[PDB]
Symmetry: D2
């Protein structure tokens, strides 16, 4: 009766701090990656190895998603928390009309359809448990369905994800399952993998992966069962999409 989390892309960026947060809480974790970074994580947590499982996976591929669920279930028997931390991002700034079909598809499959696929696998398990926490990621300002100049596909996929988070919240509330979204603001470079303490050492201090990690950790608690369908902005009042 130790709760189990499944987190996509949890060895780098924001997802690394999320993983470290849940382990620190006593949770067991399945972490996906898409390899030297994973190996250093595995080594850092040598002494708690039974509570940490690594699986290689491309979240745009249905089969790989089926396999991370199968491997989590095989070793742990349960999935209590699904953190859809993985979010393929086209860093290039260009207009929708200039998008390659490969880029469009990567955004949609990577950010919206990957979540559908996962849910299709994980919701039934959560129903059997009468417990589930789904955490999706948005971007700042997401709940207002905004356009994002030069981020067409990403924004479209994530805004669509907003709708989906909400629908899943209403459809699965019956079964002890909550679905929420966290929106990180502009957390840049080294600060993605950094702690609050570190940012505070140097508007104000930079936002960090820990800021996200502590918000996700709060939504995953047993007594957060009434918080569902909500979008938590963790941006420190710093505008991104404008």
């Amino acid at each position: 009766f130790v709760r189990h989390a499944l987190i996509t892309a949890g060895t780098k960026g924001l997802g690394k701090q999320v993983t470290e947060k849940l382990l620190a809480k006593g949770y067991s974790v399945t972490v996906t990656y898409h390899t030297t970074a994973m190996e250093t994580m595995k080594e850092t947590y040598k002494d708690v190895e039974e509570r940490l499982q690594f699986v290689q996976a491309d979240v745009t591929k249905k089969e790989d998603l089926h396999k991370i669920v199968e491997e989590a279930m095989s070793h742990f028997g349960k999935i209590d928390f699904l953190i859809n931390n993985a979010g393929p991002y086209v860093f290039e700034r260009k207009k929708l009309v200039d998008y390659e079909e490969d880029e469009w598809n990567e955004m949609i499959q990577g950010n919206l359809t990957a979540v559908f696929h996962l849910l299709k696998l994980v919701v039934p398990v959560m129903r059997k448990q009468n417990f589930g926490r789904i955490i999706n990621y948005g971007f700042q300002g997401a709940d207002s369905a905004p356009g994002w100049i030069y981020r067409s596909a990403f924004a479209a996929a994530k805004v669509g994800l907003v709708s989906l988070t909400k629908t899943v919240a209403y459809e699965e509330a019956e079964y002890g399952i909550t679905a929420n979204m966290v929106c990180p603001g502009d957390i840049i470079g080294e600060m993605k993998e950094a702690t609050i303490q570190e940012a505070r050492q140097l508007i104000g201090r930079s936002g960090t992966g820990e800021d996200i990690a502590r918000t996700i950790s709060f939504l995953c608690e047993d007594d957060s069962d009434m918080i569902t369908g909500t979008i938590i902005e963790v941006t420190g009042a710093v505008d991104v999409i404008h």
Copy 2:
């Protein structure tokens, strides 16, 4: 020197009234039809007198190849695309939770309502830039602008809510070129009312295709160039999604 429109699925339902409106305003139209040859046949004969202004093209608008064909055929006969009216869009009539969706169902919704638009924009927007004139019309649903959940409609809500954001993004990206992009949200106009006129509703008030069509033709007007990125609801204050 007269304005040409491209309307997907323009011989049935809402599209029928939209096509009838634009023809009545003096516009030329390329209309697409999937399967129903009978529909396009009775619109053929109705408009024999204005044969020169009207053109039927068979197309499955979920197929990239067919999307290229309609654009190539409109450009062939009329040399321009002034208005793009994305009237087509698959709809799953069965009410079912997302966790019950077959992969094929999910993909039809995304591909038909979101990705197909991207594919059309990709073809038609370059032509509009050249023209220094464009009117893009997309369809949503009541309340879409707030990115809501919609129980039993997860895939459709998600795809149209992503389309809300896409519509606004395209509006920001293409404003320099004299191109507007807007969304019309029909209410739950059921059945024969979709191709009825307002006068026909007043004799029987219900919403109709005309209510939608006259909104679209207001937006396609030349002096409507400052209206862009807006989601106009034509519902009559009547909740659909709760």
Copy 3:
């Protein structure tokens, strides 16, 4: 049986173009002001005096609001369109906590409570008519209930007004009354009173852009359009 519009602050700014629009459409109009702009307008439409009436009013004063309704009804016997074009605005950029109590109250009273007062008078008239068009103004992005740095009070009252336009659309639908909001972007200076043609020769949004949206919402066959917010910003961010 010619339709009648009541427009607040319709002698200058955006309101001016809206008045001129409805007049051109063949309508009759009661315009408020809170003076030489009224006289120049009064001079321009000497020919059609019968269709244009001017009433002085402070929109933040409930007594004046009752007076405009009375005067319109005495003269015309009906109110078909209500266009709440007036909207005091604090042009200074100060943080919320720097507001004087009088500044706060002007924004709330001027932008939210004024509309309630007017609706309270005009709605019964519209129900009896089985017809009404209520038009409110917001600002760009208002539909998302956004904050607005240095425009706290204005934004709060205008965002509240969004809620109000929607509630009134639902509550009054059964009487042939629609309520809709128009949100203009940054129309600055002369462009507020400008025509679309003029702008094309100098494009900045104009008062006529707002006017033609309002005119379309006011048509007999726009009965199905209600509780909507229509942005006429031309894809220019204002509030960020």
Copy 4:
């Protein structure tokens, strides 16, 4: 060096649970009460052993003079105001259309839900600035974030939706000073369940004051400083406003 909270209407309903939570978290609290004196005497009995961290002040929150009184009383005893929990909220229980509103009913809704907050912020924000620390908590209703209409609740909806905006504005203007401002939206929590613990509700699930209380609790934390301008729904995926 214990953090001080000021909470309007904190001896009854949701307010009571929030008050009990903050006490359990080690904080001192100034709680305001309007009419009922028996309720505040009973709470004052319950917490005899922590009298020093609990101050009661009589106040009508719709009166500017009483607002100065509570801030003044708080500063006198504690020398600081760390959290402002605007729990009070006048509510017209009678379900009527806007046109049937008395000039006086409208005015109480605005004055009590919106202007009252402004007056308090006018008094408390400058204290927070000097401390370089602040947590502002306002209340909304389910779905307030999308500025909806609410039939038969027009004045309350309008005042609460205006408050949404005010909250975000305060958040952007005051981030420099380490002040955050957030909204919590309770769903329909009924009667006794307002003063109930989550624990009580399980042994009966219904939402409680404790569900709201623990959210505020989380938002007041020192490490919650990157969460600002966010509207958190603690509904339970139960729609009320339709």
